[PDB]
Amino acid sequence: ERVVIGSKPFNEQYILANMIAILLEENGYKAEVKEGLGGTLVNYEALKRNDIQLYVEYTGTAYNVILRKQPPELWDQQYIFDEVKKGLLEADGVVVAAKLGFRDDYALAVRADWAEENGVEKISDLAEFADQLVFGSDPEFASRPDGLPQIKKVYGFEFKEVKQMEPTLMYEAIKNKQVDVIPAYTTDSRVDLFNLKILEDDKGALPPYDAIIIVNGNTAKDEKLISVLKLLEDRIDTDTMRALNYQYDVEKKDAREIAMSFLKEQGLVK
Template sequence: MIQLKKLLTLALILFFTSSTLAGCLPGTGGGQLPENRVIIGGKNFTEQDVLVHIMATLIEENSDIVAERRGYLGGTNVVHEAIRTGSIDMYAEYTGTGWTVVLGEEAIGDPDQVYDGVQEGYENQFNIRWLTPLGFENTYGLTMRPDQAAQLGVTRISDLQEHAPNLVFGCTHEFLERPDGYGRMNEYYGLNFRSVTGMDPGLTYAAVRDGAVDVIDGFTTDGRIPAFNLVVLEDDRAFFPPYYAVPIVRQETLDRLPQLEEILTRLGGRLTNEEMARLNAMVDLERMRAETVARMWLEEEGLIP
């Protein structure tokens, strides 16, 4: 099953970089891009879409740059391949993801060391720059219904060890494949779940709330965790690395549009975990458009008129 997922992931990467996004590249069917245009990509979940619109709106309101928005492109491998090949110019990545998934390094707990490491690694290998962190950290957190967690006496991930053979684990397809994901986590904590179900990121929270699964790989800034009254288990053995969100941009794009870095730096440290969770909830629970939520937050922060 996991081998099939790897093949599907590879097929998606090839698809996006060779066909869907090909029309955006100079010299392809899409024609030559204007010098003042940037293409901003995003992964396939709500937070990423909100960040696409935050960055795009900030750029357009503070310059003559036209920002093309390409949200929901796919998982990490797809979006990384898009920026590496120039199909997109930038997106928001997470430090721990860049460190473990893209650079293939072992997870470490020091956030500054991880940030310095991805800066150096991406610049040397891909000519891609990590700019100023946005402020929040969206780490993985194993998430359960509070009544079941209380019944089992589970508050930490290590507490799951004796109960895992009777529990169903639900997670995103990407989590099944990541080096900081399902397989390594099980080995690290000695877990052996009864079964595992891969699903779309938008379905996991309802699945655990409704009892279709017992434990999920939650994102700690997801507004559905408090809204659905779920609990996040303590990563008591510090398995997951830090995952601070940071705009990353191709150096060629920064050379072409030097004002871009200064504009994006204005977002530095502005988004707290609580703020990001609030914006995510507006989209997921209040059914507001991500673009509307992004503009509202930028106005609240005084970053746009």
């Protein structure tokens, strides 16, 4: 019957899940979006359970949070993709249906004037100031293996204080000085708007986060359903995701409207 689509609680997740729901519905499936079902592992366990049949995950997240693989020497796009696609399949029967075409990385962002004034443009530079800095995390970055724990492993420091909040509130919080550092999402143009400087990950702590549609094993045997999903393969580059996200967060357009209008524009619907 219905193909239920999971989502983590932020812009592109609501947009992409809705975009997949409209496509599936144009091709004769009933679809339902569970917006903001929970974080990565709540969604992944839902997926395993078949409470949802697919959602949009990221290679680095799959690699580190879901599969708990050990970080390699150097992060390599293709290596992480292949290890994720093999590891999801072999471990849980989960299938990468599609690579959407964009990357949505975690990247440490500070207020741009603050880093102008203090001579800071890499993460290893934050070491001198970390004990003075308030980190405003999204719901996951603080505790997950590739987050603050990885910053401590590689860079050797931790922050004065850590606050946790919904992902979309990070941007306001660092604009309004309630926090001083955030794990910004690189597909969020509020990084440019609010005059933040994403810092260089100079020791290569963080993996690439390439966006993928993942589908549970049983849903993936439906070859039609998979071919509908592949209509989105390499269809949204990073710039396009940023612009679509901009529409949602800044211009406050509805997620579904954004998705439908993208899909009309691409010749995929109507």
